[PDB]
């Protein structure tokens, strides 16, 4: 069995739960059979026993690096089933925090990639920027991560009076912070070596194994669900998908640094053009009534009581709605009976497909190569294990 | 609109330029300069006990049960805080107090079960259960984390002044 | 330039009362800086805010010995700060 | 700022000069005020021992024209 060893779950490499059994002839990997479920927790079965609004917090936990972008996918899905759409301001918000979240994920993916490679200073440089972003989350939702801000009918509460200005100061500067990382890794005489020509994935093979993410975009396939199938108001913004050639760990990386750059272009716009308005649908049927209203109007209390205690009561149907979560296509197939609690909610995780590819990517590769490839797939075991 | 992240003569000037890059490690020296630069920047860390990382009014933190200024506890046991809790954390059983009013005999938030969603803060009609600002309640024993009505009411009395200020700041938004 | 840097360091050292007073601040916090005293709460605590310092460190509290008779001079605890002054320290409210 | 990495270094430096000054004064005090002669080749030893045999029982003791 080529001295088969099992990559450690506690190992600093990996996201904490990857038992990668690998039969290795000395320092060459013959076969990688990743094991999963070290973080299965039941997220899909638990949701069937919970109402739509009390299952929203599960989505933040599915892949929590990308806390909100995941919610947007459930939101969209529940809105489609109800044929309700969020108010204009809420849409821009979701794109504002949708992008901020993409940066947060890429800062995680690029810097954590380097820590496993052995570069440790980029992580500390950008985790300070991350920190500053979390604070946006907190001052908008209340929680640093795991906000629950994007709900099925829009956002929960309007932005605090003053956030936009700060999401500007930060954005105005973050670029230089990405630039710095660059001067340390993009052209390092050594980053390139450990990353270039490692885990090349063909274009036809990437579509075949369902990669659907930067992993496809890195191979040169042009597909951004945000441009091909616009969701929210990502249609009203203008950004450039960072397509790649000679797809390999280095090229895709460059792509993730480029979407960090393009997301700052989308954030700028959202700050420049966010409309005055309400942040939640006006249908007390789907969105909970404002607290001044429920404390002075009978129809609002009844709607508050029923919504919190029982639920939306989504019309019977089923939908697969996919967004472009930072990792890749995140989709929720939400079958729904007329009941207030869902019937099924398979979460498509960009990551179940990517891990599977580890085998077809890391072939004839050294132990260190496997560490580099797990990084270039941004595997968050929450989404894979669900 | 798409963009090519990495899509791409040999002249002595060029080559000599490239060879020097490999031979004297020019780009490697570039990287060292960046880190030397920050060494000179002010560190961003805070003395944790002395200085605290800023949390704005909506921070959910630790559960507390509020009381009316008069002194009557706000909760009237409608028990929908129990209904909407995602984790099944809050357990409420009630009976009419001798006054004839409606009050909770037992209100138990299991904080280890709670995932601090803040929906209970949302759901309460009298807004009796609130997400209090304190986040530092780490406990030596698991039992201490389970909280009955007396701990939460006591938590409410201790932090009422700040809870009132926080709710004061954010209620227009809600 | 640096001479003014040195004068600032001298004033910080002289700022905490006597040699013994700064030694006390030195040991429990490990940071010496001078700021206006915003308030002293009834539980022994002293609070200082400096506008010049960055957002994370512009508000700091120097904890006091036995705030409930606990020998707190060395085992400093975050919970010691009173609830009223907790939000000022965490920047929840600008007002002292 | 970066002012603080200096404390530690100071205690490294001070602990890397001691050795060089120490070895170079425990020689000039255990060799009669003169560098410890370096016997690299037989001849340097000879003159070193010849000198011992010359006077007293130690080489640093150096008899001069007045002998």
């Amino acid at each position: 069995t080529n001295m088969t060893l099992n990559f450690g779950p506690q190992h600093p490499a990996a996201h904490g739960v990857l038992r990668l059994v690998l039969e290795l002839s000395g320092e060459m990997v013959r076969k990688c059979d990743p094991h999963i479920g070290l973080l299965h927790r039941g997220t899909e079965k638990l949701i069937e026993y919970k109402t739509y609004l009390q299952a929203l917090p599960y989505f933040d936990r599915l892949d929590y690096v990308s806390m909100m972008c995941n919610e947007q996918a459930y939101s969209i899905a529940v809105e489609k089933l109800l044929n309700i759409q969020p108010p204009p301001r809420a849409q821009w918000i979701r794109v504002l925090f949708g992008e901020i979240t993409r940066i947060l994920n890429h800062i995680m993916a690029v810097t954590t990639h380097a820590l496993d490679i052995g570069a440790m200073t980029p992580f500390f440089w950008m985790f300070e920027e991350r920190e500053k972003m979390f604070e946006f989350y907190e001052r908008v939702s209340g929680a640093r991560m795991h906000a629950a801000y994007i709900r099925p009918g829009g956002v929960h509460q309007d932005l605090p009076l003053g956030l936009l200005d700060d999401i500007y100061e930060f954005s105005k500067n973050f670029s230089l912070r990405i630039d710095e990382v660059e001067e340390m890794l993009t052209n390092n005489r050594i980053w390139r070596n450990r990353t270039v020509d490692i885990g090349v994935v063909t274009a036809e093979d990437a579509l075949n194994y369902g990669f659907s993410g930067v992993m496809l975009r890195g191979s040169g396939i042009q597909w951004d669900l945000r441009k091909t199938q616009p969701y929210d108001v990502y249609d009203q913004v203008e950004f450039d998908v960072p397509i790649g050639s000679r797809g390999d760990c280095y090229d895709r990386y460059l792509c993730r640094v480029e979407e960090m750059r393009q997301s700052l272009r989308i954030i700028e716009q959202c700050l420049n053009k966010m409309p005055p308005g309400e942040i939640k649908v006006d249908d007390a049927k789907v969105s909970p009534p404002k607290r001044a209203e429920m404390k002075t109007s009978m129809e609002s209390l009844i709607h508050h009581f029923k919504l919190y205690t029982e639920g939306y009561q989504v019309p019977p149907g089923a939908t697969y709605t996919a967004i472009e979560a930072p990792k890749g296509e995140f989709g929720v197939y939400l079958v729904s009976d007329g009941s207030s609690r869902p019937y099924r909610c398979k979460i498509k995780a960009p990551g179940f497909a990517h891990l599977a590819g580890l085998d077809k990517m890391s072939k004839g590769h050294m132990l260190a190569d496997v560490v580099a490839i797990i990084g270039t797939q941004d595997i968050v075991f929450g989404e894979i294990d669900r | 609109t798409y963009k090519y992240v990495n899509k791409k003569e040999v002249d002595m000037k060029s080559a000599t330029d490239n060879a020097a890059r490999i031979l004297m490690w020019t780009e490697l020296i570039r990287g060292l300069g960046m880190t030397l630069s920050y060494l000179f920047r002010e560190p961003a860390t805070i003395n944790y006990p002395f200085e605290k990382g800023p949390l704005s009014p909506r921070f959910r933190g630790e559960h507390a049960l509020r009381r009316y200024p008069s002194g009557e506890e706000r909760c009237i046991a409608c028990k929908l805080c129990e209904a909407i809790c995602p984790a099944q954390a809050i357990t409420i059983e009630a009976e009419p107090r001798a006054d004839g009013s409606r009050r909770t005999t037992r209100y138990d938030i299991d904080m280890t079960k709670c995932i601090y969603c803040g929906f209970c803060q949302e759901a309460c009609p009298v807004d009796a259960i609130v997400e209090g600002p304190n986040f530092e309640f780490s406990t030596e024993t698991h039992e201490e984390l389970l909280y009955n009505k007396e701990k939460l009411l006591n938590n409410g009395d201790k932090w009422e002044a700040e809870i009132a200020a926080n709710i004061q700041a954010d209620y227009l938004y809600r | 330039e640096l001479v003014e840097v040195l004068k600032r360091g001298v004033q910080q050292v002289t700022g905490h009362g006597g040699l013994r007073g700064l030694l006390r601040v030195f040991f429990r916090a490990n940071d010496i800086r001078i700021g206006t005293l915003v308030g002293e709460d009834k539980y022994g605590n002293k609070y200082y805010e400096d506008n010049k310092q960055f957002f994370g460190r512009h508000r700091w509290v120097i904890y006091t010995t036995e705030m409930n008779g606990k020998n707190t001079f060395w085992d400093v605890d975050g919970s010691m700060v009173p609830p009223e002054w907790h939000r000022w320290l965490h920047c929840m409210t600008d007002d002292p | 700022m970066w002012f603080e990495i200096l404390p530690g270094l100071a205690i490294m430096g001070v602990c890397l000069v001691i050795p060089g000054v120490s070895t170079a004064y425990i020689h000039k005090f255990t060799n009669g005020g003169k560098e410890k002669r370096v016997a690299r080749v037989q001849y340097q030893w000879y003159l070193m021992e010849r000198d011992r045999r010359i006077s007293g029982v130690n080489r640093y003791y150096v008899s001069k024209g007045l002998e």
Partner: peptide
């Protein structure tokens, strides 16, 4: 900040761009 105008120039020369414009210390 508090660069003193010489640590700042070593910072600018070593980095190759102006950090003064995009500082790590957020201010009012």
């Amino acid at each position: 900040a508090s660069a003193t105008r010489v640590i700042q120039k070593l910072r600018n020369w070593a980095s190759g761009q102006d950090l003064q414009a995009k500082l790590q210390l957020r201010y009012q």
